């Protein structure tokens, strides 16, 4: 057959490769500059684990010679060695001073203490928020201003074992701020032991223990859109349901006790497709996992109700709750969102993806996957098209995407983009999605895999790097356009 269909081959039988006969995809998550810096502040204001402080060392100083991140990272990581368009901005700039500040690199914000507040939305988000409270209290010498409400958020992060909610970041710095408690001491040493043995073939820490359900149920969704699924997609559909958390979503990773609704609307396309009987029962809780959390503006938020609808997550949960016919109210509901929220040029946002192409890709599928007749289908193939021409404009030479208009070109930015044209117009020989395959199909490593540059952010914008995903995600733009 053609290129394209060779290329997918070879793809799906590596994927279909790293599935265990758990029914996983592994899904590790590569060092970050960021935690293995605090774990080195960590381990060494304790004179613990020397061996773990030399390699961390070691590490970061490898990584800011050969690749280093963003440069807030880099400032991190130099302090322990010696634009942002949304509505978290301002909390994150609180957050990363007060990091920094922690470190000894700058001033401590000069803020009122609630500030650091916030509302219960994210598990971890709270733990985050207090610890640097705690640490800002200490390290401006005003101690007494920590509440025993305070401590007790950080309780978590002395329990043995993996990080809480799979969170090195939210542990670290949570046992930062800890180790300036007596009555707290008495529990740190077996923890740090536990980190210290966290440690990546190279030295450093990650930000999470991985994204194995995220990944799963990519890889579980991209198998099941080909000719043939494989059968191992029953295994998968099986080890993700028996993951499901009591409010019927899903987290990223095992044991994450926090759904957010990006997770469960993968988890729930893919049960649709390849187990919508045998798993019937996890199906209809994913749903109502989903309703239960729609906002009253007709949008979806990532992580609980009340908090910013946001336009990828409305249209993830737009595309997964049409399938059935009863939702038919909330599903139009959350596609006028959508519309209402595109960009004059076209665009929509970046959120938990550093590409423009990721929420343009969620915005397309649930624009034209919902079907509809009348003014409303003009409206909504109107937004699309403008979405797909926003893709066609800023379309590199070598027929693939970056991250940002202007940026290099990498898989997995381009992945989206294909997902996205795949459903616009027939790929004409020399059109945009044609030349987008002809870049995916040129990529392709030997091994029958991608290598890309990571788009995963967290906390948000911040990268990390989840290598499995590569493949994941150029395998269902493969599927979706063959
Ligand atoms: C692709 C993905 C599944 C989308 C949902 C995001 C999440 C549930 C999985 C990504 C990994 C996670 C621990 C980042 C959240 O960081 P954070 O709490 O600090 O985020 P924030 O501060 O920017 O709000
Ligand atoms: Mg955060
Ligand atoms: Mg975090």
């Known amino acids: 057959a053609t290129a394209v269909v060779r290329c997918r081959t070879r793809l799906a039988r590596r994927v279909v490769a790293a599935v265990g006969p758990d029914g996983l995809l592994p899904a590790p998550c590569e060092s970050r500059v960021l935690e293995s810096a605090l774990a080195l502040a960590l381990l060494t204001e304790e004179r613990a684990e020397a061996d773990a402080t030399a390699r961390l060392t070691a590490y970061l100083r490898t990584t800011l010679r050969t690749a280093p991140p963003d440069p807030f990272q880099c400032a991190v990581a130099r302090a322990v060695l010696g634009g942002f368009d949304h509505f978290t901005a301002g909390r994150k700039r609180l957050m990363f001073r007060t990091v920094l500040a922690a470190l000894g690199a700058t001033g401590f914000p000069a803020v009122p203490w609630e500030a650091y507040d916030t509302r219960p939305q994210q598990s971890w988000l709270h733990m985050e928020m207090k610890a640097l409270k705690v640490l800002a209290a200490h390290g401006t010498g005003h101690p007494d201003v920590v509440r025993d409400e305070d401590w007790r958020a950080l309780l978590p992060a002395l329990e043995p074992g993996p990080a809480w909610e799979c969170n090195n970041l939210a542990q670290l710095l949570a046992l930062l701020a800890l180790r300036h408690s007596p009555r707290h001491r008495p529990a740190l040493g077996d923890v740090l032991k536990h980190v210290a043995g966290r440690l990546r073939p190279d030295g450093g820490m990650p930000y999470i223990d991985g994204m194995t359900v995220f990944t799963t149920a990519a890889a579980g969704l991209a198998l099941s859109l080909l000719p043939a699924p494989p059968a191992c997609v029953t295994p998968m559909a099986d080890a993700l349901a028996l993951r499901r958390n009591p409010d ?87 596609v006028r969102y959508v519309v209402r929220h595109q960009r004059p040029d076209g665009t929509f946002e970046r959120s938990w ?128 356009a063959t």
Request: aromatic residues 6%; hydrophobic residues 40%.
């Open 248 to 334: 019927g979503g899903y987290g990223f990773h095992s044991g994450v006790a926090q759904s957010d609704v990006e997770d469960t609307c993968y988890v729930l396309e893919f049960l649709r497709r390849a187990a919508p009987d045998r798993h019937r029962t996890a199906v209809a809780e994913a749903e109502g996992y989903l309703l239960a959390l729609r906002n009253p503006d007709g949008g979806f938020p990532t992580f609980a109700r009340g908090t910013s609808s946001e336009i990828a997550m409305t249209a993830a949960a737009a595309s997964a709750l049409a399938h059935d016919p009863d939702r038919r109210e909330e599903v139009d509901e959350a």
């Open 353 to 480: 993806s550093r590409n423009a192409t990721n929420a343009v890709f969620r915005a397309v599928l649930a624009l034209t996957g919902v079907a509809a007749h009348g003014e409303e289908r003009r409206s909504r193939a109107r937004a699309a098209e403008r979405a797909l021409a926003h893709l066609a404009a800023t379309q590199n030479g070598d027929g693939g995407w970056g991250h940002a208009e202007a940026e290099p070109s990498d898989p997995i930015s381009t992945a989206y983009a294909v997902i996205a044209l795949a459903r616009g117009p027939r790929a004409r020989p020399g059109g945009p999605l044609d030349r987008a395959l002809a870049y995916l199909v040129e990529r392709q490593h030997p091994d029958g895999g991608y290598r890309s540059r990571p788009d995963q952010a967290g906390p948000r914008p911040l990268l990390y790097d989840v290598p499995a995903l590569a493949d994941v995600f150029v395998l269902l733009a493969l599927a979706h």
